[PDB]
Design a binder for this molecule. Structure first.
Ligand SMILES: *Cc1c(COP(=O)(O)O)cnc(C)c1O
Ligand SMILES: *Cc1c(COP(=O)(O)O)cnc(C)c1O
Lengths: 424, 422
């Protein structure tokens, strides 16, 4: 065991954090329950709201009794078995649910252990698909700027070149095709231009890959769902697969079960993750259509050569089943609409603040965009004083709260955001 | 769902590893070294001779691991590792730093082995960029290797005999030395050095599996090669990366296979047995020098950060698994396992279809003169109360460390009968 001081000491010497350095200070978390984290501030444990849902994951809050129970129930019977030559109930139950609730036509599921991996699996499916059609020249990807798809090297290649620091990786990453930043408001001219650019690359392109409706890590930007309708149409006419990365948008977050639903379109391949397990454990999945699966499987190449060791882990699958069932068993649509309303009401006053350039809400996502970078040394202690854990990045103050947050809690979260923006 | 229903859903909707779409056996329980599987409508108990792909070193449902998991679950399932830290991450980092080859002082947690390999590569590239030598961006390895299924990991898989052979045209083009031989031959090392010499200015790192190459063909090599690799890399200023995702945590008879050579790499990857086979977790360790050079470079930071980085549940069960291993005389245990495998597999050498029998720690291998047909091997093993998963021309086992001598004997007996049927 360790005290918070010893935790800090070990951490400082030995632990890498996300996109950070060694030797160039994290706060100790000692507990988490419901929408609340218990953190150590100046030696004292304080409870603060998890306004980020621990990076989109904790949709039902932490330690939800239904999810805890599902995990302990599975733990008593079978922790894990290899998915090579064996199958099990949690995998089957989850696959059936996912095929049932995702956009029409996605009826095969490949489980993996993280979002980045599921994106690489998606790309491999796309590339292998065209090889299966005797068109191995179709091996590039196309996306629009502003996106994020994970940190592995292939995933990096489709991340926004700036957000992704591609300047530090020149000569290393695959060279992919980038369309301009998709605008917020629908402009048919944008889709016409996208089509024209894609058309000249069509014989070289395996797939278009995008985050539908909301671009998360790349800048919390929203775009009209009609663009997705356009992409589906362009992809169909030029024979390029469409891949939706719903790793952040999945499971109700944008006000629809999957953001694709806002557009009423179905991609050829889809990735889900983050909230899949209700934020308990790492699990991801890549779904594809019957046509994709068979075309791969009928290829001379044959099998899809991917197989994570912990593929379809019974514990992760079991909690995900429970997380998904819990979401489906409640009036989730009304819950998100309410959250969206609370965020809109709460954030409204920031729009008139001097440093604020935009205020936007989409389902259970609220964003204040400022006219300059947000100083974390100022923002964090402010938010903590107000009982809220916020993680601004760049010029963005934002939140994606647990679905279980009460009106009072949403008011607390937004009040802390508005204050952070005021201090900007 | 009943077993028949599971099979129905699975055939319709589930993609399995390394396979096409369009039958698996239903597993319904796991306890200790035993799986309960359903065969012809009836539950049967079979030994998990594969430790569930090399993960379940303490067996399934071990009370110490189960309780570590439920204890952590009561307190905190997960928080984002951005701006926060926690006891499970710190306890595990401290353990890993203490038990791995000397000099490995920093720990980057990720969710899978393939990711940890990409993290290792990113460390190496960023390191040289930090030194002002961005031309050092290629990797070198020897043939016969396997490092995962993500695109960077694939680039260092064996390019002809390896599982990723069909992708070679789209992968980064790396530098390959010939297959490392089993017995030590100074001429092999000299040739490796001569090859590396000509690429030194473009090489970020040498990356290899130490002592045992797993998925590439369960081949063993003399630890002395690792000593030469360390020497060569030091002299030519190329980083040395060991992928111990398969070999770690006692599997080869030493705590880490590098220990057989007394060598420390600059960067090291671990996974699989890290969590005792409960949950997915991996880690990439590097020296203080590598970390600082990255941190002081133009980037100012290592540009990677998985959503579930340092997951408290996975870290907590890993802590318990490592402590359980260290808290017993694991070396004697593995030596006893190895003796049992050796004695049990000895009669396979005489069989007509068997080309080699070899054992290294708790790994036992019968190499056959043809690819093993699973449709024949699987039922033959199940009839003998053992779950075996051959691949290529290999019938092999990596049993849980908790297997008794009788259980090892049952495992090796089934392997021999499988080899007899080939
Ligand atoms: C977070 C994210 C990923 C990467 O998921 P990891 O589990 O961190 O590898 C990929 N795509 C999107 C849209 C994401 O938000
Ligand atoms: C299994 C393995 C990996 C990859 O582990 P995954 O969890 O399947 O990504 C990498 N390297 C070696 C040596 C391995 O044995």
């Amino acid at each position: 065991g360790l005290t918070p001081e010893q935790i800090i000491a070990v951490d400082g010497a030995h632990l890498w954090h996300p996109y950070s350095s060694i030797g160039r200070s994290p706060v100790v978390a000692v507990a988490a329950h419901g929408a609340w984290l218990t953190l150590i501030r100046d030696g004292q444990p304080i409870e603060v709201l998890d306004a980020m849902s621990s990076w989109w994951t904790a949709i039902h809050g932490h330690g939800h009794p239904a999810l805890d129970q599902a995990l302990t129930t599975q733990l008593r019977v079978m922790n894990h078995v290899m998915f090579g030559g064996l199958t099990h109930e949690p995998a089957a139950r989850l696959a059936k649910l996912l095929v049932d609730i995702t956009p029409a036509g996605l009826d095969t599921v490949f489980f993996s252990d993280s979002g980045s991996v599921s994106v690489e699996v998606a790309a491999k499916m796309a590339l292998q698909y065209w090889r299966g059609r005797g068109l191995p020249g179709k091996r590039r990807l196309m996306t629009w700027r502003g996106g994020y798809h994970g940190d592995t090297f292939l995933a990096m290649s489709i991340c926004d070149p700036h957000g992704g620091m591609h300047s530090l990786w020149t000569d290393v990453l695959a060279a992919q095709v980038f369309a301009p930043q998709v605008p917020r408001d629908y402009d048919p001219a944008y889709s016409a231009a996208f089509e024209a650019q894609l058309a000249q690359h069509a014989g070289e392109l395996a797939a278009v890959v995008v985050e539908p409706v909301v671009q998360g890590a790349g800048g919390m930007r929203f775009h009209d769902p009609r663009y997705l309708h356009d992409l589906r149409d362009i992809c169909r006419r030029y024979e390029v697969l469409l891949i939706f990365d719903e790793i952040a948008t999945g499971f109700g977050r944008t006000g629809a079960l999957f953001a694709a639903d806002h557009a009423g379109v179905s991609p050829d391949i889809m990735c889900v993750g983050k909230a899949l397990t209700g934020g308990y454990l790492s699990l991801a999945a890549t779904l594809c259509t019957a046509d994709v699966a068979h075309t791969i499987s009928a290829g001379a190449a044959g099998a899809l050569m991917h197989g994570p060791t912990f593929m379809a882990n019974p514990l992760a699958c079991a909690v995900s089943v429970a997380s998904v069932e819990l979401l489906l068993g409640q009036d989730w649509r009304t819950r998100i609409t309410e959250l969206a309303a609370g965020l809109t009401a709460g954030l409204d006053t920031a729009r008139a603040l001097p440093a604020v350039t935009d205020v936007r809400v989409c389902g259970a996502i609220g964003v204040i965009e400022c006219d300059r970078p947000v100083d974390l040394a100022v923002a964090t202690p402010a938010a903590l004083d107000r009982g809220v854990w916020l993680r601004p990045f760049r010029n963005l103050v934002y939140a994606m709260p647990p679905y279980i947050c009460t009106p009072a809690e949403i008011t607390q979260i937004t009040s802390a955001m508005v204050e952070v923006a005021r201090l900007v």
